């Protein structure tokens, strides 16, 4: 059994002069988990394909 998430995030694409269009590409991530042979999780990793 495996589980997963998509990260929703914001940071400014700040220009040196300053800018209004602070958006486009962000370090969002995608995360995976699984439950082990006693039901505790461990492989809560970030492949972020």
């Amino acid at each position: 059994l495996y589980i997963s998430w998509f990260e929703v995030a914001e940071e400014k694409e700040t220009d040196s002069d300053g800018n209004i269009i602070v958006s486009g590409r962000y370090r969002t991530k995608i995360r995976l988990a699984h439950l082990g042979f006693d039901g505790v999780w461990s492989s809560g990793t970030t492949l972020r394909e």
Binding site: G36, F37, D38, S42, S43, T45
Partner: protein
């Protein structure tokens, strides 16, 4: 109680079997009969 004990080890065992070798130290410039140390880590996270 033994089944809980067994599976508590067998969860850990597979991470060890997946360890990845990153680098190895040759004896400066020498060859033959070297101790040749190696360093390795877990792939699932860079923690160990």
């Amino acid at each position: 109680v033994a089944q809980k004990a067994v599976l508590g080890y067998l969860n850990n065992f597979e991470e060890v079997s997946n360890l990845e070798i990153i680098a190895g130290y040759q004896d400066g410039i020498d060859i033959e009969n070297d101790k040749t140390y190696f360093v390795a880590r877990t792939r699932m996270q860079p923690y160990r």
